[PDB]
RNA sequence: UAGCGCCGGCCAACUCCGUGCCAGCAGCCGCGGUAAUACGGAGGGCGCGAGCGUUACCCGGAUUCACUGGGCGUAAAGGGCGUGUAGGCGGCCUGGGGCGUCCCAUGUGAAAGACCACGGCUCAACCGUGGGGGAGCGUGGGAUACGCUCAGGCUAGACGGUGGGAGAGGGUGGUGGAAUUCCCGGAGUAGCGGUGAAAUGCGCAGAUACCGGGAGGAACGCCGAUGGCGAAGGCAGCCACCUGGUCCACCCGUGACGCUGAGGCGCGAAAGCGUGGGGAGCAAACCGGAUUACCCGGGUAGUCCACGCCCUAAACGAUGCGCGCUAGGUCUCUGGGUCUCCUGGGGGCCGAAGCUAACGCGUUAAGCGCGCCGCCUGGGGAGUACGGCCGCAAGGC
C-alpha cells in the first residue's frame, strides 16, 4: 500500500452494479461506494506480477487490450514503450479464434503502405487511389499495434473485464491466461491473474500499467 | 413442515455443493453426524464441527472441490458428484448381507444403518449384516 | 432324393424382357399411366436345408401402467374454492420392550424340471449317479442403528398472551350529491333527434335549448394506482353497529399439541327457475327503418330486493397444499428499530446457478428435496349410449 491509495485505486462502483462473486476483494461500504480491500489487492497484484515476470523472462509476448475512452492512451503509451502488441479502438469478433482470416488483413495493410511508398502509382486513375487510400486508413486505424503480433500471444491484458468480455471469453476459449485490472463490477472466475482495483480514474490505470511495462522491460 | 432430517441434509450438502460454498449449516443431530463422520472419512467433505447458532445447536460441514479446470468454465470438479436418499419415510427399503449394492464398482460408497452401527457398504460386507439403506454417494 | 422363401428401405442378395394406375404386390412406408432393382416371367444372387414359408396365440422390442423405470404452464393430464372423517406421513435429548429390521443354528422347501460334475446308449437328443442352490414359513438364540411402542425431559414447528397497524373482506340499518326518465308550472319558436350518408321516429295537442318545484329506480364521477382485501367466486359514495382473516414488536406462557386429506359438509361470477315485490336506464326475443346491393329508432322477459332452487365457465397464474436449501439488482404497499440504512410480511420487472423440446421459469421457481392428495396412457366415435344419483325444468355428476 501506500502507493495504491492516494492513486483512488480502493475506489469501486455503487452498490448498484456490484456482482457477488466479487464480495472477496471488497473491503467495506462508505457513503455509498464500494471499497477494495488493498492488501488482497497487494497479494494479488503480487502473484500477477510474479508471473508476468516469468513470462517476460522466458521470451513470451502479452497483448494489451483496452477498449475503453479513457485507458486508449495510456494503453498505447505502455505498449509502445515495450514491445508488446495492443489493441485499442476496438475489438474486432474473432481476432483470436480466427487469428488466420485477421492476418491476411495484416498483410493487407502492409503491402498497401508498401504500395503508397512505391512508383507504379502514376497509373490508378486518383479515384481508385482514394478508395485505396480510405481502404489503408481504416486498416491503420483498426489493426494498428496488432501487426506486432506474429503468432497466438502467451498472455492478455485486459483492463475491463467486462466491458471487453467477448476478448476474455476468446482467451479462454484457447487456453491464454488472463490478466485483468477488474473492479467491482467484475467476474473474478474468468481472471486466471487479477488486480483488484480501479478500472476507471485514469490516476489508476496509468500506475498499474506504467508499474507492469516497467516490470516487463526490467525482466528482458 | 419437515418430514425428513436426513433428506434435508443431503438436499443441503447438494446444493450447497453446487454453488461452491466453502461452508453450510444443518440442525445438530446424532444420527446426522454419524453420517458426516462417515463422509468425512471416505474423504467426501473436508470436515465438520459443532456450532452453536442463536442459542440452537448446529453442525457446519466444510466442502471439498478439485483444482481449477483450464478453459472455458473453470470451475473445479466436484467431489460428490451425484447424492440420493433411498430409504424415504412411507417407503423403507432394508437389504440382506447378500443384497448390499455395489456403487460405482466400489468407486462410490453406500451408507447402512445396521445393528451395528452406521456402517459403509465395505464395512457391513466385512462384518457380515444387514440394514436400513440410507444413501449412496459417488 | 433337393427342396422352400427372398432380392425398394428396414434386412443379406440386381439385370433383361411383358406391362402402362390394367393385371396386380403389400407387415409399415408405399410401388404400378410405355426406360418398374416393389407387378408377371427369365438369368444371376442371398438365407435355410428334408425342410422352407403362411395363419392363430404369448412374451420381448414397449421406459407404451414406468417398484427397478414415466408424466400433468402451452403436447393427454392440478379437482372451481374451503373445512374436515378414515387413512398415509412426522421435530431434539435419554431410558425400558425387541413388533418391524438384521444375523446364526435348525426343520421344511417331495420326486421330476433348472445348474455343476462324472458317466451309459459308436456322438447327440435321451437317461443315470452324486453335489449344491432355493423365494417363503415354523423353531431356538443374538443385536439395537433406524422405524414401532412406552416412560421422562427440550424449544427451533404449531398455538395462546400482551402492545400496536393497514385494508372496495362479510352481514344489518341510516342517508349524500351528480346524471337519466316522467309529472306539475313559466317562457320559447319550428325543428329536434339520428348516421359513413340517411331513413324510421318525435314536434304546431308548441317539440328541442333553458328556469323552478315534485316523484321514482339504479349506480357511485375526481381520489384511482402497474394500489389494497379475500380460500376461491368476488369486493369501490358516506355514517354507525355485529363480525372473519392477517402483519409487526415484546420473547411472556404450553411442550410436538403438526402436514395432507378418499367420502361428508359448506361456499360458489354471469345466465336461467319457483313464490312475492320493484322497474329509472340498458336490453335477449320481438315491432320497425334503412343502406356496403352490421347500424339507428322503439320494446318484452332479464338486469334491482326477500326467501328457496340451479352448481356452470378461458371458475386461468391454463401452474394442488405444507415445509426446508440455492447470487443479486430495481419499483411499489404496509409495519418495527438505534432511521444515508438494517429488519419482517405482500405485490410487480430484469436476471446467478440450475431446469426445459423450445417458448421461457428463476427466493411469489416451471431449480434442488421430502410427505399427502387429484388426474394421463394415440385421434375421432364421445363427454355420446346404457345404468345410477341430484334437480320444477333447462340441465348437472
Redesign the pocket.
Known sequence: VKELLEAGVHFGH????????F?RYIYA?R??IHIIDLQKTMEELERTFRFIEDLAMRGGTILFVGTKKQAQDIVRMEAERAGMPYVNQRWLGGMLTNFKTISQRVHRLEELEALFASPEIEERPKKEQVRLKHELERLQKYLSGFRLLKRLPDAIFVVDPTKEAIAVREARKLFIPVIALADTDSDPDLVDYIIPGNDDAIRSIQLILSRAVDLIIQAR | ????????M???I???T??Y?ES??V????????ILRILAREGFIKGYERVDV?????LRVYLKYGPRRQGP?P?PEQVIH????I??????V??????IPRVRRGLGIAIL??????LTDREARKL?????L?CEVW
Do not use: C, Q
Open positions: 455503487e452498490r448498484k452494479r456490484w456482482n457477488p462473486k464480495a461500504e457513503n455509498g | 413442515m419437515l418430514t425428513d432430517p436426513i433428506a434435508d443431503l438436499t443441503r447438494r446444493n450447497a453446487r454453488v460454498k453450510t449449516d440442525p445438530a443431530s446424532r444420527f446426522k453426524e454419524e442463536d442459542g440452537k445447536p448446529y468454465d470451475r451425484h447424492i440420493r436418499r430409504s424415504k419415510p412411507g417407503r423403507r432394508y437389504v440382506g448381507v447378500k443384497e444403518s445396521t445393528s451395528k452401527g452406521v457380515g449384516v444387514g440394514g436400513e440410507i
